[PDB]
Amino acid sequence: KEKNAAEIRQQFAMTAGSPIIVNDKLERYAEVRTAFTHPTSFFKPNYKGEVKPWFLSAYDEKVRQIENGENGPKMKAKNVGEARAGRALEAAGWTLDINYGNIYPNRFFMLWSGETMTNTQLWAPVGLDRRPPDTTDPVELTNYVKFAARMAGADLVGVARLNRNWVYSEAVTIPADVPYEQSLHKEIEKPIVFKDVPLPIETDDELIIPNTCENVIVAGIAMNREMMQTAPNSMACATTAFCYSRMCMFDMWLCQFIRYMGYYAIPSCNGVGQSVAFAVEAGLGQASRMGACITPEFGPNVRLTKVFTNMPLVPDKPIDFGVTEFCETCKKCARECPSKAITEGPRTFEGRSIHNQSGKLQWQNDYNKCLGYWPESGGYCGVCVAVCPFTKGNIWIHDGVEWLIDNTRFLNITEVWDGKINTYGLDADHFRDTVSFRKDRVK
Amino acid sequence: AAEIRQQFAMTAGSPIIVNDKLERYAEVRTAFTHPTSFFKPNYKGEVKPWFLSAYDEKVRQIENGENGPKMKAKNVGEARAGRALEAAGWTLDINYGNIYPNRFFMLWSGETMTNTQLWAPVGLDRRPPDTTDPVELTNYVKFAARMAGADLVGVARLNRNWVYSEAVTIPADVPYEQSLHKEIEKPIVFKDVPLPIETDDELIIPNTCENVIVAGIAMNREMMQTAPNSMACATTAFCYSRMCMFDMWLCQFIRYMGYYAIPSCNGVGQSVAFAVEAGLGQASRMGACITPEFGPNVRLTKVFTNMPLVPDKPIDFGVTEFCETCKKCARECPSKAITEGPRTFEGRSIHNQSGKLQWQNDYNKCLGYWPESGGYCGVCVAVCPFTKNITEVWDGKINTYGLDADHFRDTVSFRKDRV
Ligand SMILES: Oc1ccc(Cl)cc1
Ligand SMILES: Oc1ccc(Cl)cc1
Ligand code: SF4
Ligand code: SF4
Ligand code: SF4
Ligand code: SF4
């Protein structure tokens, strides 16, 4: 029986309701606390023992590896030139992304209004962004916006009511008068608040999200299987990097579509809020031991972005295809983790350290150990994504009645350069899994 | 499809036949920019810049619940959605085509880019090439091209005949909001310089700039087949932003490999000529490069570089003789812009480059239909055999970037087909 992603998602759809279990310890999380930004984790030694901002220490190891003809830690490349090309590809992938993740809200690519964008100015005479909506039916809007999402480069798209618990209490950002070359040295915190205002707006003191901002649209941006399996080496960094620029194009494309439909839209990429939680509530997949959203189509080998809007939409249903029960007995990522950051124990409500948000049932991982391995290996690792059985494209079987997971799955870089590739690193042998008709965009 | 292309490979050599009259072409001559063709009346009779008259028609259609010229939409909401999708698709494109060289997204050096600054400590762009082998480099840069969103990619030696003699651009310090009012003409010249450079007077391409990399960027068949209505505009627009992201992605990669790279999108030179010389496809009667995978329903962009590379072979799979007897685009063209006669060396008007053997088309008649229809037409692309209502499109099949899984296997690539 030919693999049917729409059948699979229908079979495992849940009934409405956020699936994330929480208790009263839960409060919104200040984005400064992520290991990338918090002062307790931000500094790491390089290979000479010099303590630097982690990404500068990682740079030192990238340079070292190229000079020694390596594609990763102790991993010899075919020659220096191949070591060079992998890092060149990686660096180029980030072309449309600011400071590793586009996290500063209402700066650069992440503008909360379209009014200053070159494309909005060019189209101003048509007035699409000033004309009131001609569609208010959530059903038709869900079909329109999901079609646009797919055009905008999403391999998966889902809708959920916006749960403010996952919105950062305060954002990391920079002052509006600071130019790019100073951005890394002038980062600040700024509260994200919800107020009774008509449009998203930023004051000197606050990022203000309107109380009418009802919905969140979550996009899955698929990474390349062959490149990710080279984790923690350079080609895994490259597919990661290219997908961040894909995320950026997505947010901007979709926000402009939403505005031109007569609503407002907030982009985010890696900022504003926690993408895994939004993705779970929008039904893209389930939370996992490693901490990522695992999807039926790609496993965890998919990046996430999201857009916030007041456009009426029909929320999608959450999905339960057994990931919690497989993670409970699998532990492959925990055992392969080069830094031992992923726990082998049970889910709790108690954060392991400042980097976890306490008050939600989840596997609690030590994300400072994880970041610690990035300067050491000179990349973004990804070994956990690479070894997860759900990242295999072969995991689904049909028994003549229904779909199930094959339990048997839970029991070099020259060839990547020389081997299969296709547009955006997508795989034509699986590209049918994300074909979409109206019946699977809205019900 | 990888076997079809080698089956139809020609011997080396540009397949574009020229005579002793051919001269490089001033970009200002195109119908989009030339003063003889730039102004067009709107439906009220008011004479305006053509795209502004076209705006007026889009507004009138939305108010009247139309997806195109006297093409009724399901309702006003649907009419609004098509135009909203078209407008959004242009987000990463400056003034319809990114033609101004070394401006906005089309920077001829990576040095001021945020990505380059962030990565400056690694020094990939300052470091001499570690690979000078054109065979390895051709495999690397084509892999990168596919990552960067190209559905097709080819290499050719740079034929300077198809580089514009003078570019349309703006002065460097002019803010975006004045750009449309302050466009100027600027010579593109080749000189013995290390790097691509712009002075007050000239865009200077180095004489070392040996090669051009041509990308094909596939458009959605269902959407294009609504030409000349709004969904054909939307797939046109979205692919222009894909072109821009391709140019920047690939230029950055080529720069981080130790070479220089010039983006262009719709600027700098004539895409169709470059695509034929790079083996992507064959010139056609409508004027487009017809490819075996997509026919003409594919956009083009290109990057120029001194990176050593193995040129591809031009391809002959019978387009010229098929166009010789087909004439379907000529008969369907709403403006009678496409000729039904033979190919000549003599342009029909100022918008053609004379001196090369091609079907000569009147591109001002084409442009005139765009304000009238409120779109970018595309009927020729839609009806062309090689290429094979709006509610059903909005309700029907779609996939990432508007690509089609029933055909996506045809652009799978391995090293054997890359070099
Ligand atoms: O998710 C991320 C964020 C930063 C970096 Cl360098 C890599 C991946
Ligand atoms: O090729 C082009 C150029 C400009 C426009 Cl408006 C549409 C298509
Ligand atoms: S490797 Fe196993 S335990 Fe880890 S996320 Fe994947 S399925 Fe869950
Ligand atoms: S990215 Fe690497 S270090 Fe981090 S949790 Fe995954 S396997 Fe461990
Ligand atoms: S775009 Fe339309 S008007 Fe122009 S040549 Fe093609 S069919 Fe004719
Ligand atoms: S419609 Fe016919 S004549 Fe026109 S370009 Fe296509 S094949 Fe050639």
Author numbering:
A (entry chain A): 3 to 413, 431 to 462
B (entry chain B): 7 to 394, 431 to 461
Text from the published report:
PceA dehalogenated 4-iodophenol (4-IP) three times faster than 4-BP, while 4-chlorophenol (4-CP) was not converted. Activity measurements using 4-CP, 4-BP and 4-IP showed an enhanced reduction rate with decreasing electronegativity of the halogen substituent from chloride to iodide. It has to be concluded that exclusively the differences in the energy of the various carbon–halogen bonds determine the displacement or continuance of the substituent.
However, only a dozen of the corresponding gene products were biochemically characterized including the tetrachloroethene RDase (PceA) of the epsilonproteobacterium Sulfurospirillum multivorans. The crystal structure of PceA showed the norpseudo-B12 non-covalently bound in its ‘base-off’ conformation deeply inside the protein.
